[PDB]
Amino acid sequence: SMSYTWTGALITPCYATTSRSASLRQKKVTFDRLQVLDDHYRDVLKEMKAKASTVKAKLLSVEEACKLTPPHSARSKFGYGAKDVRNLSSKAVNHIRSVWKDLLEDTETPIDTTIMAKNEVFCVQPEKGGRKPARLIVFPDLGVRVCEKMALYDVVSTLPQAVMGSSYGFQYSPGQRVEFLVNAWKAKKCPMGFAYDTRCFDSTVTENDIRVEESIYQCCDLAPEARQAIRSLTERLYIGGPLTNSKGQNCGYRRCRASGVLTTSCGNTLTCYLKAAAACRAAKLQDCTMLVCGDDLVVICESAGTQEDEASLRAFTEAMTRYSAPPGDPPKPEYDLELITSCSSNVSVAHDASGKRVYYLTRDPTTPLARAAWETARHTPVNSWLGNIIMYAPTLWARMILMTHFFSILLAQEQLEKALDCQIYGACYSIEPLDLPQIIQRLHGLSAFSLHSYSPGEINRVASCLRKLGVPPLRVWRHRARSVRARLLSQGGRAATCGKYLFNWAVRTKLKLTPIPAASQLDLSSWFVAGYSGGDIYHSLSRARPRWFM
Numbered sequence: 281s282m283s284y285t286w287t288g289a290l291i292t293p294c295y296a297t298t299s300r301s302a303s304l305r306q307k308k309v310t311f312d313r314l315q316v317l318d319d320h321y322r323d324v325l326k327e328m329k330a331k332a333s334t335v336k337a338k339l340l341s342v343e344e345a346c347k348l349t350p351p352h353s354a355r356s357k358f359g360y361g362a363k364d365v366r367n368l369s370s371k372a373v374n375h376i377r378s379v380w381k382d383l384l385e386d387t388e389t390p391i392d393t394t395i396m397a398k399n400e401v402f403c404v405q406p407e408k409g410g411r412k413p414a415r416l417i418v419f420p421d422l423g424v425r426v427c428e429k430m431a432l433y434d435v436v437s438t439l440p441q442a443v444m445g446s447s448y449g450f451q452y453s454p455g456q457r458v459e460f461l462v463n464a465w466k467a468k469k470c471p472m473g474f475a476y477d478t479r480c481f482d483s484t485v486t487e488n489d490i491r492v493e494e495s496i497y498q499c500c501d502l503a504p505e506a507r508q509a510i511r512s513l514t515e516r517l518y519i520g521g522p523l524t525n526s527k528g529q530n531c532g533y534r535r536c537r538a539s540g541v542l543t544t545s546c547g548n549t550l551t552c553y554l555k556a557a558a559a560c561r562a563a564k565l566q567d568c569t570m571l572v573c574g575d576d577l578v579v580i581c582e583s584a585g586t587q588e589d590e591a592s593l594r595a596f597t598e599a600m601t602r603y604s605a606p607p608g609d610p611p612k613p614e615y616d617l618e619l620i621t622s623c624s625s626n627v628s629v630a631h632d633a634s635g636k637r638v639y640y641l642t643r644d645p646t647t648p649l650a651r652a653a654w655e656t657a658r659h660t661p662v663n664s665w666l667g668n669i670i671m672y673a674p675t676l677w678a679r680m681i682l683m684t685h686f687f688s689i690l691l692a693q694e695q696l697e698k699a700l701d702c703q704i705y706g707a708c709y710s711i712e713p714l715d716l717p718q719i720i721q722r723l724h725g726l727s728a729f730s731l732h733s734y735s736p737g738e739i740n741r742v743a744s745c746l747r748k749l750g751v752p753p754l755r756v757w758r759h760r761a762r763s764v765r766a767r768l769l770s771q772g773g774r775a776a777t778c779g780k781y782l783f784n785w786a787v788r789t790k791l792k793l794t795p796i797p798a799a800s801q802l803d804l805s806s807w808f809v810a811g812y813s814g815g816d817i818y819h820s821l822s823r824a825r826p827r828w829f830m
């Protein structure tokens with residue numbers, strides 16, 4: 281069937297990509313899907329189902345589901361918003377209950393969704409190709425979004441790791457992911473790797489793909505109500521349904537993956553993994569290691585020679601294509617792990633304070649920097665700068681520019697202690713900038729505060745990137761950080777820990793850094809469990825057993 285059908289009603293709103301370029305995107309993501317399954321696909325599917333059988337998932341309470349709702353979550357069309365839900369307002373609660381009862385009783389009626397153009401901020405690039413048409417966001421009403429959590433949050437948290445094991449991308453902290461890739465690359469006698477990119481993955485996702493995904497969730501130990509909810513949600517929401525613009529007008533219909541549902545990450549990860557595992561077999565790739573993050577895929581296998589490797593890669597692509605997962609740019613085999621780019625990241629290595637090698641993830645800074653510039657300019661609700669600080673803590677750019685710029689701003693506005701909302705693997709997080717050292721130590725380790733000996737290639741990328749954006753050079757940043765550090769130190773408590781640890785790089789005479797004792801009390805049990813992009817999940821950072829001297 282067609283991924284989408286349209287009435288012609290415009291996608292209305294509520295550089296930053298806008299609702300103007302929405303029509304250009306619509307044309308790309310709209311097509312009939314052709315899918316042919318085989319025994320390899322069927323086999324891998326049964327192996328996945330067997331691992332799912334071991335999962336037991338629990339039904340979440342209305343209360344449990346509510347607390348998971350982000351405070352700025354899109355308001356319901358039934359007269360309540362995120363605040364009411366979180367507060368367990370009698371109105372919100374009663375509607376949620378009715379929504380639930382309706383999933384338990386109605387098994388066929390399509391549930392309405394809202395289509396919107398995501399206003400993501402990207403850099404002004406006049407050189408290469410074209411100014412990217414805006415990504416689409418499809419989502420049900422807040423009450424449905426709450427019911428999704430009751431029935432499937434435990435499934436989407438537990439099941440992907442049970443099924444995929446170490447191949448599951450979102451189970452890893454940045455350091456863990458790096459360690460996984462390095463060990464896998466080292467594990468091969470003669471390693472070869474590649475990244476496989478799918479052209480509009482969400483659109484290539486068929487209704488059968490969605491039915492197979494439910495067939496996996498149905499292997500869990502579920503409460504009969506959870507079981508029904510999943511059945512009804514698959515039929516009425518996940519396989520497709522009508523599209524409505526922000527102005528209440530009917531836009532058309534969907535028969536592919538909805539980008540803003542709880543099952544988007546999980547479902548996409550499962551689907552991609554299924555197809556890829558099957559395609560590996562079709563291409564006869566030897567000793568495969570996969571790493572899957574939604575639609576993003578990386579394969580590290582044993583090389584069989586440059587000509588053979590290129591051939592098996594075409595084989596893989598042909599199978600993926602038959603399964604309805606064709607590529608954007610066709611895959612290229614790499615024989616350096618640093619050379620594999622996935623989720624825009626790439627492996628780099630630096631040295632610690634004692635000279636030991638340290639692998640870390642990096643990326644080109646152009647987009648994180650431009651988005652940060654947009655954010656300093658206009659008060660955005662959710663802050664990419666803080667997420668990039670967390671994710672790319674060991675990187676040269678995050679330390680020298682992001683940390684320096686934003687810490688001086690919080691000093692100026694006397695707002696170090698004020699919590700901010702940022703993103704980690706699709707989930708929304710409330711984080712106090714004063715907790716950044718503890719968070720960093722727990723996701724990257726002490727070395728993150730004392731990395732040096734950066735590669736000439738990374739230094740140059742950073743240097744160039746600064747030049748093209750009109751950002752002062754790295755020496756200017758060292759001067760500024762020396763001051764930011766001085767001010768943070770003269771404030772004690774967490775502020776001085778930010779000074780000492782985050783800005784140890786800016787001082788010629790480096791301090792010996794010992795572990796932060798309060799870092800152990802940080803509960804990050806919900807942090808690197810799973811991916812929830814479009815999932816509408818919120819976690820406020822909490823601290824189990826606080827000592828007085830802190």
Ligand SMILES: O=C(O)/C=C/c1ccc(NC(=O)C2(NC(=O)c3ccc4c(C5CCCCC5)c5n(c4c3)CC(=O)Nc3ccccc3-5)CCCC2)cc1
Nearest residue numbers: 649650651652653654656681682685749750751752753756
């Ligand atoms: O010695 C040498 O050889 C050179 C020295 C030198 C060169 C330039 C300066 N710049 C400044 O002082 C000012 N800008 C900045 O001190 C500045 C800081 C961060 C900036 C950022 C981002 C960096 C990441 C965090 C968010 C802010 C951008 N731009 C920045 C400019 C340049 C800018 O204006 N906008 C953009 C646009 C896109 C991307 C980045 C930027 C402040 C007053 C006058 C302009 C200072 C010294």
